[PDB]
Structure formats: C-alpha cells, structure tokens
Design a protein around this ligand. Structure first.
Ligand code: CLA
Ligand code: CLA
Ligand code: CLA
Ligand code: CLA
Ligand code: CLA
Ligand SMILES: CCCCCCCCCCCCCCCC(=O)OC[C@H](CO[C@@H]1O[C@H](CS(=O)(=O)O)[C@@H](O)[C@H](O)[C@H]1O)OC(=O)CCCCCCCCCCCCCCC
Ligand SMILES: CCCCCCCCCCCCCCCCCCCC(=O)O[C@H](COC(=O)CCCCCCCCCCCCCC)COP(=O)(O)OCCN
Ligand SMILES: CC(/C=C/C=C(C)/C=C/[C@@]12O[C@]1(C)C[C@@H](O)CC2(C)C)=C\C=C\C=C(C)\C=C\C=C(C)\C=C\[C@@]12O[C@]1(C)C[C@@H](O)CC2(C)C
Ligand SMILES: CC(/C=C/C=C(C)/C=C/[C@@]12O[C@]1(C)C[C@@H](O)CC2(C)C)=C\C=C\C=C(C)\C=C\C=C(C)\C=C\[C@@]12O[C@]1(C)C[C@@H](O)CC2(C)C
Ligand SMILES: CC1=C(/C=C/C(C)=C/C=C/C(C)=C/C=C/C=C(C)/C=C/C=C(C)/C=C/C2=C(C)CCCC2(C)C)C(C)(C)CCC1
Ligand SMILES: CC1=C(/C=C/C(C)=C/C=C/C(C)=C\C=C\C=C(C)/C=C/C=C(C)/C=C/C2=C(C)CCCC2(C)C)C(C)(C)CCC1
Ligand SMILES: CCCCCCCCCCCCO[C@H]1O[C@H](CO)[C@@H](O[C@H]2O[C@H](CO)[C@@H](O)[C@H](O)[C@H]2O)[C@H](O)[C@H]1O
Ligand code: SF4
Lengths: 41, 80, 105, 165, 74, 68, 197, 226
C-alpha cells in the first residue's frame, strides 16, 4: 500500500489528479453558469 | 591547424588522451597536481577539433581547450 | 512690427554686455574642468598634418587686449546670440502685426 | 457612450446578431420532431443563447458598429462608468489566484529543500505537505509582504550564482 | 580648434549622478565609443533603424508627395 | 607543517572562482592536499554541473566561509 | 537647535541637524550628499523669496480692488495699456520682456558668481541696508521666520494656481465663499480636484 | 497560558501556545502571527477593526431597534446615507467624505507613529502642551484621554478580563456586521426585519430558502416538490 501510495505520490499522478480536479471544476462552473463573460453577481 | 591549450587546473586523470581519436594529447611529468601528471599537445597539427578531450575533462570549466581556425587537410578530416 | 535696426542692435549690444560684464566671470570657470591642464586637456599631439590640424591654431588664444578675457571668438558667439534673439523678437512682432494670435487665448 | 461605443441594450447590430443566431438555431430545430433528444438539445442551446444575449445586456456592456461587446480597459474610466468588473476585478482575482499558486510553490520548495535529497521530494511529491500548504495559502499577500519586510523573500546577490562577465 | 565649445569626454565625466545611483556614471565612455568602431556602428544602425521606422510610420499617414495616397500599391 | 594548509575537512566553503560553475555556491570540503599543489582544496557540491561532475579542485584564495 | 518636527516620533536625520528651519522632514532621504544639500538649501531660499514676492503681488493686486492676478497680463493679449495702481506707465511688451530678460540675466549672473556657500545662502552687505542680521541669535530667528513664511508662500502660490485652475473665482471671492459657505463650497465641491466627489 | 481552544484536539501553533495574549484561542491555521512584530501589527489591526465593528453594529442595531419599537423614526442603515444626502440642509457628500477622511488621516497618522515607535507621541512641546498624555500604555491601548474615567486603572487580572471582553464582543461585532451586509445583499431587508422573520417562521425564513445565498438550492426544492 505504501509503495502504491508513493507511486501515486509521483509527479505525473498528482499532475493528472490536479488536471482532473481543475478541469472538472471549470467545466462544472461553465455548465452551471452558462457563458460567463461579465462579472455581475 | 587548431590550437590546443592546457592549463594548470588539470589533475592528470589521462581522460582527455583516452578520448582523443587522433593521438594529439600526451601525459608529461609534473609537480602541480597530486597525480604528478600534466596533459600536453605535441601533435596539435593532427587535431581536427572534435572536442572529445573537453567532454572527458572532469574539472570544472575546462583544463583542456580547443580553438578552431586555419583548417588543413588533416584538420578537416579528409580522406581525399 | 518693431524696426529691425533698433531691435537687432539692442539685442546684440545687451548680449555682448552680458558676455563681457556678466557671464565672463562665469566663463573660464566652466572651462576650468572642461579643457583644464589637470584633466586630459589637449586631445592631440600634433605630429603629422592631420594631428596638428586637430591642434588649436595660434589665433584664438594668443593674447587678450581687452581688460577682461573677452576674445573675438566670444565676441562672435555673443553677437550671434544677440542676432538670434533680435531676429526672434522681430519674427514674433511680425507674426503679431499680421493679425495672427499664437498665444493661448 | 465612451469611446464612441453604444450600449448593448440600445445597440442595433447586437439585435441583428441575436436574431441571426436565433434564426439559424430555429432552422436547425425545424428539422427534428418536437419529441426528440436533438430537439431538446437545440432548444437548450437556443435558451442558452437567449440567456447569454440578455445577460450581456443590462450590465453596462458596450459594442461598436458590429454588435460585438467591447471591454473598457482603463480603471477610473471603468470605475466611473460601471465597467470595473470587466477587467479591473478579473485581474484582481487572477492576481489573487496566481499569488496563491506562487506562494504555495515557494513554500513547498523551501520546505522540501531542508531534508536530504530534495530532488526526490521534488519528483515524488509529499502529498500531505502539498495539501497542507494548499489550504494554508488563503492569506498569501500578507505573508508575502511580511517576508519582503523581514528580508526572507529575497536572497542576497553574494549567495546567488552569477554568470561570468 | 577655437577657444569655445564642448568636450564630449568632459560632458561624459560630469554626468555622474550623486549618491551612487549609476555608480561611476558615464565616466570612461568617451574612449569606449571612440576606440570601438562597433559601438558607433551599433549606435548608428539603431538610430537609422528607428528613423526608418519613423519614416514608414509617418509617410503613409502624412503623404509628402503629390498623388501618393491615391497610389495604393506604391 | 603547523595546523593545516587549508580549511577544516567537512566544513562548508564558498567558491569565489568566477569561471567555475559553482561561483557563489556552497560546497563541502572532502580533502586538502598538503603537498603544495596549485589547487589542493577538494570541494564536493550537491548540484552537478553540465558535465555531470560534482567535485572540483580549488586554490586557497578562491574558498571562503559561507555568509550567513 | 532643532526648530521642531513635522511628525512627532519620526526617525531623526543626522545630516539635518544644524540647518536653519530644521523640522526633520525628508522621508525619501533626498539630498543626503552635503553638496546637494547646500544646493537644495540655496534653491529653497530663492524659491522662498520668489514665492514671497508672488504671494505679495497676488494679495496686493486684490486687496486694493485692482483685479485678479490671472487677468493682470491680459492687456498683452487684448492690446490694452499696462497699469500699476492707476499710473498707466507707458511701456510696451517689447520694451518689457527685453529689459526684464537683461536685468534678471545680469542679476542671476552676479548671484551665480558668488563663489561662497554662505553668501550664496545669505549674501548680506549691500542686500542688508538696515541690517538686523548683526546679532547671531536674531539672525537665526529671522532665518527660521523667513523659511517658515517662504514655505507658507510656496503653498499659497500652489493654492492660487490650483484654485484658479479648478474654478474661475478670484482669491478674495474664494475666501469669501469659504467663510460664507464653508461646508457647501470647498475643493470637494468643484468636481475637478476630486474625481466623482 | 491560553483562554481556550477554538478547535479541541488540534495542535496549537507554537507562537500562540505559551503566549500571554488577551483573547487568544490559537486560531492561526495560516501561521500569520509567526513573527512577534507581525503579531503586534495584527493585534492592533484586530483592535481597530473590532472597534469599527462594534461602533457600526451599535449604530445599526440600537436605532434600528428603536424604530422597530417605534420610538425613533430614523431609516435603516442601507438608505440612511441616501436620505441624509437629500436633506434640505445637507452637507454635500464629497465635502463630508474628504473632511472626515482628513480627520481619519490625522488620527491614523498618530496611530502609525505611536506604533512604529512606542511612546513617541509624548515628545514635549508638540501638541498644545497636552502631548504628555498621548503616551501609549500597551499595543493598541493608548490610555489618557482615551480612558478618562480610569476604568483601566485596576488590577492586572481585571484589565485582562476587560480586554478579553472587549475583543470577544469585537469579534462578535465583526461577524455581526458581515452578516448584516450579507443578508441585506441576499434578502433585501433590515437586520431587525430578518430577525423578526426568523422568529416568526424559522424554517421558511433562512439563508438556504433563497437562491442568492446558495445557488441551485431553489432548483432542487422545485425538483423535490414536483
Ligand atoms: C488566456 C486567454 C483567455 C482568457 C482571458 C479567457 C477568458 C474567458 N473565456 Mg476563453 N479560451 C481561451 C483563453 C482565454 N479565455 C482558450 C485558449 C480557449 C481554447 C481552449 C478558450 C475557449 C473558450 C470557450 C469555448 C469559452 C471561453 C469562455 C471564457 C470565459 C470563462 C469565464 C468563466 O469560466 O467564468 C468565470 C470562472 C471562474 C472565475 C472560475 C472560478 C475560479 C475561482 C478561483 C474560484 C474557485 C472555485 C471555488 C470557489 C474554490 C474553493 C473551493 C475549492 C477549494 C475546491 C472568459 C471570458 C467561455 C465564455 O463564457 O466566453 C465568454 C466560453 O464559452 N473561452
Ligand atoms: C499607465 C497606464 C494608464 C493609462 C495610459 C491610463 C489612461 C487614462 N486614464 Mg488611467 N489609471 C491607471 C493607468 C492608466 N490609465 C491606473 C493604474 C489607475 C489606478 C487604478 C488609473 C486611474 C485613473 C482615474 C481615476 C482616472 C483615469 C483616467 C484616465 C484617462 C485620462 C488620464 C489623464 O491624464 O487625463 C486615460 C484614458 C481618467 C478618466 O476617466 O478619463 C476621463 C480618470 O478619472 N485613470
Ligand atoms: C482566463 C484567464 C487567464 C488565464 C488562463 C491566464 C493565464 C496566464 N497568465 Mg494571465 N491575467 C488574466 C487572465 C488570465 N491569464 C487577467 C484577467 C489579468 C488581469 C488583467 C492577468 C494578468 C496577468 C499577469 C500580470 C501575469 C499573468 C501571467 C499568466 C501566465 C502564467 C501564470 C503563472 O505563472 O502561474 C501562476 C503564477 C505563478 C506560479 C507565480 C506568481 C506570479 C504572479 C503573476 C504574481 C502575482 C503577485 C504580484 C506581486 C502582483 C503584481 C504583478 C506584477 C505584474 C505587477 C498564464 C499563461 C503571468 C505571465 O505570463 O508571466 C510570464 C504574469 O506575470 N497574467
Ligand atoms: C511555483 C513555482 C514557481 C514560482 C514561484 C516561479 C516564479 C517565477 N518564475 Mg518560474 N517557472 C516554474 C515555477 C515557478 N516560477 C516552472 C515549473 C517553470 C517551467 C515551466 C518555470 C519557468 C519560468 C520561465 C521560463 C520564466 C519564469 C519566470 C518567473 C518569474 C515571473 C513570475 C511568473 O509567474 O512567471 C511565469 C511563470 C510561468 C509561466 C511558469 C508556470 C509553470 C507552471 C504552470 C507553474 C508550476 C506551479 C507548481 C507546480 C506549484 C507547486 C506547488 C507544490 C505544492 C506542488 C518568477 C520569479 C520568468 C522570469 O525570469 O521573470 C523574471 C521567466 O522568464 N519561470
Ligand atoms: C481582520 C481582522 C482580524 C485580525 C487582524 C485578527 C488578528 C488576530 N486574531 Mg482574530 N478574529 C477575527 C478577526 C481578526 N483577527 C474575527 C472576525 C474572529 C471571529 C471569527 C476572530 C477570532 C479569533 C480567535 C478565536 C483568536 C484570534 C486570534 C488572533 C491572532 C492570530 C493572528 C491572526 O489572526 O492573523 C492575522 C489575521 C489577519 C491579518 C486577517 C486577514 C484577513 C484576510 C485577508 C481575509 C479573511 C476573509 C475571511 C475568510 C472572511 C491575531 C492577534 C487568536 C489570538 O489572539 O492568538 C494570539 C485567537 O485565540 N482571533
Ligand atoms: C513628484 C516627482 C518626483 C519628485 C522627487 C522624488 C523621487 C526622486 C527621489 O526621491 O530620488 C531620485 C532618485 C534617486 O536619487 C539619486 O540620488 C540623487 C538624489 S539626492 O542627491 O539625494 O538629492 C540624484 O541626483 C541621482 O540622480 C539619483 O541616482 O532618482 C531616480 O531616478 C528615481 C526614479 C525616478 C523619479 C522621478 C524622475
Ligand atoms: C474595488 C472595486 C470597486 C468596484 C465598485 C463597483 C460599484 C458598482 C457595483 O457594485 O455594481 C456592479 C455590480 O457587479 C457585481 O456583481 C458586484 C461587484 C462588486 C464590486 C466590488 C467588490 C459592479 O460593476 P459591473 O458588474 O457593472 O462592472 C462591469 C463588469 N466588470
Ligand atoms: C509648491 C512648491 C514646492 C513644493 C515642494 C515639495 C512638495 C517637495 C516635496 C518633498 O518634501 C517632500 C514632500 C518629501 C521629501 O521626501 C521629498 C521632497 C521632494 C523634498 C514651490 C512653489 C513655488 C512657487 C513660486 C516660487 C511662485 C512664484 C510666483 C510668482 C513669481 C508670481 C508672480 C505673478 O503672480 C503675480 C505676482 C501677479 C500675476 O499677475 C503674474 C505672476 C507672474 C503669475
Ligand atoms: C469597521 C467595519 C465596518 C464599518 C462600517 C461603517 C462605518 C459603515 C457605515 C454605515 O453603516 C453605518 C455605520 C450607518 C449607516 O446609516 C450608513 C453606513 C454608511 C451604511 C467592519 C469591520 C469588519 C471586519 C471583519 C468582518 C473582519 C473579519 C476577519 C476575519 C474573518 C479573519 C479571519 C482570519 O484571520 C483569522 C482570524 C485567522 C486566519 O488564520 C484565518 C482568517 C480567516 C484569515
Ligand atoms: C547591445 C548594445 C548596443 C546596442 C544597443 C541598441 C541597439 C539599442 C537600441 C535602443 C533603442 C532603439 C532605443 C530607443 C529609444 C527611444 C526613446 C527613448 C523614445 C523616446 C520618446 C519620447 C520621450 C517622446 C516623447 C513625446 C514627444 C516628443 C511627442 C509626443 C508626446 C511624447 C511625450 C510621447 C550598443 C551598440 C550600444 C553597445 C552596447 C550593447
Ligand atoms: C572695434 C573695437 C571695439 C568695438 C566693437 C563693437 C562695437 C562690436 C560690435 C558688435 C556687434 C554690434 C555685433 C556683432 C555680431 C557678430 C556676429 C558674429 C553676428 C552673427 C550673426 C549671425 C550668425 C546671424 C544669423 C542668422 C542668420 C544668418 C539668418 C537667420 C537668423 C539668424 C539670426 C540665425 C571696441 C571699442 C569695444 C574695442 C576696440 C575694438
Ligand atoms: C464547481 C462549482 C459550481 C458551482 C456550485 C455548484 C452548483 C450550484 C448551482 C449553480 C447554478 C444555480 O443556478 C443559478 O444560476 C443560473 C445561471 O444560469 C440562473 O438560472 C436561472 O436563470 C437562467 C437565465 O439567466 C435560466 O436559463 C435558468 O433556467 C434559471 O434557473 C439562476 O441565477 C440560478 O438558477
Ligand atoms: S581530461 Fe582534463 S584534467 Fe584530465 S588529464 Fe586531460 S586536461 Fe587534465
């Protein structure tokens, strides 16, 4: 497990996790707020 | 021909001579290093400038230096 | 309009008086650290024709018969400045009498 | 009405662009039966287009001679004409997030350089430490200016590698 | 060679800001410019390039020659 | 010879050689030659150079204590 | 020897210790060099005297009801005749600019050729006819008073310039507006000095 | 020691564990107060923001409570400036803004000067002979005419208790004013009106019932009610 945990601790795995998290956050924001351009409320 | 210059920072590790593909360098006795060896270039007219001696130098910066210029038949590596 | 002789003559006389009696004490002290002997001073030895052509001639610094150091080179420079100022005043007056107002209203 | 730009609500070409987009959406919509998934998708697209065109209006947006909205750039001019949220506030938010990222990376670099073999920590991330620094960077500008004040933000030039002249 | 004028080296020596803002200032630059032809070459080419860019940016907006604005290809 | 020619072995030193890769950098003293060679101070660095090496020889005048 | 402090508790300046009119100041550490400090001292003194002259002119042109200082040289624009208290002196702009240029040229050339730092600061002699500068204590007190009134004159000249730029009202009408309607007429009610009020 | 723990079972930061500080609860998860001078600046900032908070919250609540009872007829806080600008004898907005901003500039310059050098406002012959009482006692507690009734001239334990009470009501006032702004932006009514709505109908009137506070909750409610 700790060998597997250090494998997930490697740079490409945490990079993939960050990319998935950021892409999902931005996609859900754009879906639930369709076409945001002007900062108004 | 090219110019091969060797400074006092050489440690006499003989790596530049082994990496030389045309037998330009040599080792002479010396007192400025622990190994009591110093690189020399008595056959600099046969050097082509391949900089293989500089690749094998372990000291920081370079204890051996190759300067190009005035290419000849032997310096251009021509078999014709 | 302003007549040309009175304006030009007054401008050049005032500029020459400022050169001789006013700016001359300030002169030869701005050239003290400019072409002085303590610094590089002369710029050419004067060996060949071009080198001695770089060398100053014996006409601008031979003597100063004026009580001050006002040589004829300074006379020419201050007279040129006076002619410039007089022609500037004449030009401004000429633009003024033509019915054109260049000043901000 | 600044920079010779009409507001989107009072504009003319903005309405032409809106009608053109609604017209091509309706032309695509008429090719499907009302009780179909492509019909619902095209209706949702038309609703999103109408909502976007309505929300771009009544927000101070300006467009000039083409109906395409323009963004007022200069602060002060944007502040006094209700255009601060166009670019003045988005760069403030971006500066906050970028400073968050930079401060978190700086903290990770400094805390990872202490132990033996820091390159291993660089290439094999300490995930609990990275997540702890991730949730501790909400006050990045205060910490950054305080390290600037105490001098730990900057390194002396005597200790920095310098290329030969 | 006359008794009046300005020495370039003296102007370069004098224009050193106080309180060590520019260190030694512009001192020693006269011999640097005069001895090095490449310094003058770079300065001349930079100024002439800036002037050429100015010519390009000002000829089209301010046509100095008659019937030049109508000639679009020219 | 009294004391030693160079610094204490294992102590941190700062390289003042401008042409060296590790100029204004801190390294560890491995050995100092007592024979009297030109560059007796052997310094090992954590960060390797472009050639991949991490040890070098320096003279007495190009090594000082690291500032704090 | 210190004349006071512009902010009680600021860090003192060692070089700004024995200078006349020492109110510490200098937050930007300007003029740390002694020669630049002396140049700043003499420049501040002559700016003080010029601001004194200008403030006196602007006040005296208005307390006598002779017009604004802004429209005072307007006779040059309109081609009218110059006036001074009503004398109606017969001079033209050609015969005014030239004489002013040459007179202040000889004046500033004689001032610049002093070659004495204290005399550049305070020449005395022919410029001190009555001469209350004989006693050093009264000399120091009058130096401090001159510096204070000169700084007040500089800020007054800046105030006159800014007030006439923001509003067309003259000096005395602006003063009467500030006393008559203090909370309703000030720099914040112009709409120009403060954008958006 | 410490007054209490904001989060039991959590590791107290080292700079706040042994710190004898008034109103300390170890609430520094971001470690902002690591430096002692930075801690002093943050303490002074907290004190000024707290006094801001209670002054504003009292001025919002007590006139608001009086108008709810009907004794007073002042407006609510979000339109009082608007009606006061439109008064018949109203000073212009810019004049009041810059005048009381300049007055703030005076007191805050004095505060900055006595912070960057403690006791530096007691320089003799500076403020009309009254500058001898301008010397501050501690960080953020000047004293003198700031405490003319002498309530701080007591035992040290009573002084620490008073400081703890001051900072506790101050922090409560910060969250109260933040709530005032937030639920006026959400509901659009006064704080007393919001309290009355929560008292009359607690379930129907809350932050979660409106989509402004939590977006998308109204859609979930409509889907559940469908
Ligand atoms: C670098 C230039 C640039 C810029 C300035 C923009 C900017 C924009 N584009 Mg463009 N775009 C770009 C490059 C760029 N894009 C590129 C290269 C492409 C091609 C891939 C696109 C393709 C593209 C499309 C197809 C669309 C956009 C859209 C947008 C808008 C997105 C706004 C948004 O999502 O809401 C604002 C979103 C946020 C503020 C995100 C929130 C993040 C903060 C930090 C909060 C974090 C969330 C949470 C609260 C954090 C706490 C919880 C957490 C701990 C988990 C905005 C106007 C969309 C739009 O509406 O256009 C007008 C759109 O339709 N763009
Ligand atoms: C350096 C870049 C830059 C440039 C080119 C401009 C350009 C401009 N600004 Mg802006 N400004 C800037 C940065 C800049 N701003 C920044 C960083 C701020 C601080 C937030 C401001 C704050 C500001 C205010 C408060 C005002 C301007 C105004 C103006 C306009 C007139 C300025 C003038 O002197 O008259 C002009 C469009 C004025 C305006 O709106 O013009 C009518 C105005 O009132 N500016
Ligand atoms: C959709 C929105 C969007 C996107 C995708 C980007 C994308 C990018 N921006 Mg941009 N930006 C945007 C909107 C956007 N921007 C807006 C709306 C503004 C305001 C008008 C800016 C202003 C801005 C600046 C000023 C800079 C960027 C930079 C960058 C690039 C690298 C950021 C970085 O290093 O990581 C995150 C940041 C770090 C890892 C290090 C922190 C460094 C930041 C910039 C400093 C922040 C604090 C600083 C003290 C504040 C003063 C900034 C200074 C310039 C005055 C990246 C391509 C940077 C760049 O390209 O550099 C080459 C850069 O300097 N952006
Ligand atoms: C978080 C670490 C970090 C920090 C604080 C900086 C800071 C800086 N860099 Mg550097 N940079 C970084 C990472 C970082 N960089 C990486 C990973 C790369 C390789 C892509 C570069 C490549 C780079 C170049 C080529 C240049 C800079 C420059 C700069 C300066 C301008 C500010 C800026 O945003 O530049 C913009 C920076 C970028 C666009 C790089 C962004 C790279 C990724 C997207 C960010 C990495 C974040 C990191 C993974 C977070 C780790 C957190 C940890 C918990 C895991 C500033 C000193 C410029 C300079 O010299 O200015 C004086 C410059 O020319 N940087
Ligand atoms: C901005 C006002 C402010 C400031 C300056 C402080 C400062 C301080 N408080 Mg305090 N606090 C505040 C508001 C503030 N607090 C509020 C509103 C509450 C109630 C929720 C508390 C509750 C609280 C407790 C329970 C305790 C403290 C403690 C402390 C100290 C820890 C250092 C610190 O918080 O970092 C400095 C903080 C800042 C500079 C604030 C930064 C604000 C950022 C920029 C935005 C935050 C927005 C937010 C998410 C909404 C320090 C003296 C502890 C202490 O005294 O130990 C010595 C302690 O026991 N405070
Ligand atoms: C309002 C407009 C600005 C008024 C002056 C304040 C800013 C300048 C200053 O404090 O120092 C002047 C500084 C440094 O002074 C340094 O030192 C000298 C200043 S002094 O000798 O201390 O007076 C100066 O002469 C020298 O050139 C410079 O290197 O010089 C600069 O070039 C600063 C940046 C540009 C400032 C605006 C021009
Ligand atoms: C510092 C920045 C100060 C901005 C003040 C803005 C006052 C006006 C205001 O709040 O109205 C708008 C409401 O936007 C909103 O949704 C509120 C934004 C709140 C801004 C201050 C934080 C903001 O301006 P806008 O949305 O009309 O601006 C164009 C988009 N950039
Ligand atoms: C304001 C001023 C000087 C201001 C200086 C400042 C802010 C200095 C700033 C700093 O200190 C700080 C803040 C902090 C430090 O770290 C840095 C420095 C840099 C040291 C001078 C005005 C100086 C003003 C002067 C000299 C005014 C002269 C006026 C004259 C001659 C008027 C004449 C006439 O008005 C009449 C009488 C009648 C009219 O009809 C005709 C005319 C001709 C218009
Ligand atoms: C001064 C103040 C408000 C003043 C308002 C005023 C005068 C308003 C004026 C008026 O209303 C009146 C009076 C009456 C009306 O008729 C007119 C108007 C014009 C409407 C608020 C301060 C308000 C201050 C607040 C809310 C501060 C909050 C700080 C927080 C939450 C800090 C938290 C943390 O820092 C910790 C503690 C530790 C870290 O590790 C983590 C984080 C999260 C960073
Ligand atoms: C590498 C090198 C070199 C080179 C360099 C170069 C090449 C440079 C360039 C440079 C450049 C290329 C620059 C430019 C500049 C510019 C400028 C500086 C400009 C200015 C302008 C102005 C100032 C203007 C103003 C105005 C006017 C007049 C009008 C309108 C308005 C205004 C105000 C805007 C050399 C050789 C020296 C040598 C050493 C090294
Ligand atoms: C003899 C003598 C004398 C006398 C002298 C005199 C009297 C003089 C004068 C003089 C004058 C009285 C003048 C002069 C002048 C000079 C000069 C040198 C000039 C110049 C000029 C110029 C250069 C011009 C220019 C121009 C033109 C051409 C055109 C356009 C405009 C202008 C202006 C630019 C005496 C007795 C003392 C002594 C002895 C000797
Ligand atoms: C990753 C994080 C994402 C954000 C948090 C999680 C999602 C929370 C819900 C987000 C959406 C809430 O919805 C809120 O915004 C919508 C944005 O179009 C708006 O939606 C409303 O108005 C739109 C037109 O403008 C209509 O097309 C919608 O049918 C209508 O519901 C409303 O203002 C509100 O319903
Ligand atoms: S490779 Fe370098 S150090 Fe080794 S013997 Fe040759 S010159 Fe000397």
């Amino acid at each position: 497990m700790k060998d597997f945990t250090t494998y997930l601790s490697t740079a490409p795995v945490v990079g993939l996790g960050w990319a998935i998290f950021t892409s999902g956050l931005l996609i859900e924001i754009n879906r639930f707020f369709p076409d945001p351009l002007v900062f108004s409320f | 021909a090219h110019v091969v210059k060797i400074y006092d920072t050489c440690i006499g590790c003989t790596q530049c001579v082994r990496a030389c593909p045309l037998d330009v360098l040599e080792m002479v006795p010396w007192d400025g290093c622990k190994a009591a060896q110093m690189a020399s270039s008595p056959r600099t007219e046969d050097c082509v400038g391949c900089k293989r001696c500089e690749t094998a130098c372990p000291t920081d910066f370079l204890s051996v230096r190759v300067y190009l210029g005035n290419e000849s038949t032997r310096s251009l590596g021509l078999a014709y | 309009m302003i007549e040309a002789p009175v304006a030009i003559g007054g401008s050049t006389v005032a500029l020459l008086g400022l050169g001789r009696f006013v700016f001359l004490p300030y002169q030869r002290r701005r050239t003290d650290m400019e072409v002085g002997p303590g610094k590089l001073g002369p710029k050419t030895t004067g060996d060949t024709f071009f080198d001695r052509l770089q060398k100053p001639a014996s006409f601008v610094e031979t003597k100063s018969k004026d009580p001050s150091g006002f040589g004829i080179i300074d006379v020419l420079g201050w007279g040129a400045l006076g002619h410039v100022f007089g022609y500037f005043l004449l030009a401004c007056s000429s633009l003024q009498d033509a019915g054109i107002d260049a000043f901000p209203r | 009405d600044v920079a010779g730009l009409t507001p989107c609500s009072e504009s003319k070409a903005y309405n032409k662009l809106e009608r053109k987009e609604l017209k091509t959406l309706e032309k695509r919509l008429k090719k499907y039966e009302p009780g179909s998934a492509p019909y619902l998708a095209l209706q949702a697209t038309k609703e999103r287009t109408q909502n976007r065109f309505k929300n771009y209006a009544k927000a101070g947006l300006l467009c000039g001679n083409d109906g395409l909205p323009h963004l007022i750039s200069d602060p002060g001019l944007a502040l006094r004409f209700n255009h601060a949220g166009e670019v003045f506030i988005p760069t403030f938010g971006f500066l906050y997030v970028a400073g968050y990222i930079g401060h978190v990376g700086r903290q990770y670099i400094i805390k990872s350089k202490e132990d033996a073999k820091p390159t291993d920590k660089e290439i094999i991330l300490d995930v609990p430490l990275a997540l702890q620094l991730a949730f501790q960077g909400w006050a990045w500008p205060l910490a950054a200016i305080q390290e600037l004040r105490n001098g730990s933000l900057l390194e002396k030039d005597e200790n920095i590698t310098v290329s030969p002249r | 060679n006359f008794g009046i004028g300005h020495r370039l080296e003296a102007i370069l020596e004098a224009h050193t800001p106080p309180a060590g803002g520019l260190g030694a200032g512009h001192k020693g630059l006269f011999h640097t410019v005069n001895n090095s032809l490449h310094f003058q070459l770079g300065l001349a080419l930079a100024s002439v390039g800036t002037i050429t860019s100015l010519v390009a940016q000002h000829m089209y907006s301010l046509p100095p020659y008659a019937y030049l604005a109508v000639d679009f290809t020219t | 010879k009294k004391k030693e020619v160079g610094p204490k072995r294992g102590s941190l030193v700062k390289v003042l050689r401008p042409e060296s890769y590790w100029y204004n950098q801190v390294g560890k003293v491995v050995s100092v030659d007592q024979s009297g060679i030109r560059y007796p101070v052997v310094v090992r660095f954590e960060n390797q150079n472009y050639a991949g090496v991490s040890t070098n020889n320096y003279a007495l005048d190009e090594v000082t204590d690291p500032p704090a | 020897q210190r004349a006071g402090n512009f902010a009680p508790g600021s860090e003192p300046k060692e070089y700004l210790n024995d200078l006349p009119g020492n109110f510490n100041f200098d937050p930007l550490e300007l003029g740390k060099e002694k020669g630049t400090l002396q140049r700043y001292r003499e420049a501040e003194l002559i700016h003080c005297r010029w601001a004194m002259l200008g403030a006196a002119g602007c006040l005296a042109v208005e307390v006598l009801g002779l017009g604004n200082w802004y429209d005072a040289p307007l006779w040059a624009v309109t081609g009218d005749k110059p006036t001074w208290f009503g004398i109606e002196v017969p001079f033209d702009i050609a015969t005014i600019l030239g004489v002013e240029v040459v007179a202040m040229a000889v004046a500033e050339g004689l001032r610049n050729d002093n070659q004495d730092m204290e005399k550049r600061l305070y020449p005395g002699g022919a410029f001190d006819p009555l001469g209350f500068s004989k006693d050093p204590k009264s000399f120091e007190d009058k130096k401090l008073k001159e510096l204070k009134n000169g700084r007040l004159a500089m800020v007054a000249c800046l105030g006159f310039a800014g007030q006439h730029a923001a509003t067309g009202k003259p000096i005395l009408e602006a003063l009467g507006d500030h006393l008559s309607s203090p909370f309703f007429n000030n720099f914040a009610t112009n709409g120009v000095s403060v954008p958006g009020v | 020691n410490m007054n209490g723990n904001w989060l039991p079972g959590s590791q107290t930061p080292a700079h706040l564990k042994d710190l004898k500080m008034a109103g300390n609860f170890g609430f520094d998860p971001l470690n902002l107060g690591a430096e002692p001078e930075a801690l002093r600046w943050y303490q002074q900032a907290e004190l000024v923001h707290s006094r801001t908070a209670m002054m504003a919250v009292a001025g919002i609540l007590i006139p608001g409570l009086f108008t709810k009872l009907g004794a007073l007829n002042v407006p609510q806080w979000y339109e009082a400036g608007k009606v006061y600008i439109e008064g018949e004898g109203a000073i212009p907005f810019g004049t009041l803004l810059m005048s009381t901003l300049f007055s703030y500039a005076f007191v805050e310059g004095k505060r900055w000067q006595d912070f960057r050098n403690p006791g530096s406002q007691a320089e003799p012959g500076t403020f009309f002979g009254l500058e001898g009482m301008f010397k501050g006692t501690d960080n953020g507690y000047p004293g003198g005419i700031f405490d003319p009734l002498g309530y701080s001239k007591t035992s040290p334990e009573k002084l620490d208790e008073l400081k703890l009470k001051e900072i506790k009501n101050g922090r409560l006032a910060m969250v109260a004013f933040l709530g005032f702004a937030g639920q006026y932006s959400a509901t659009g009514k006064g704080p007393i009106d919001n309290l009355a709505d929560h008292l009359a109908d607690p379930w129907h009137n809350t932050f979660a019932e409106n989509g402004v506070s939590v977006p998308g909750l109204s859609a979930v409610e409509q889907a559940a009610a469908s």
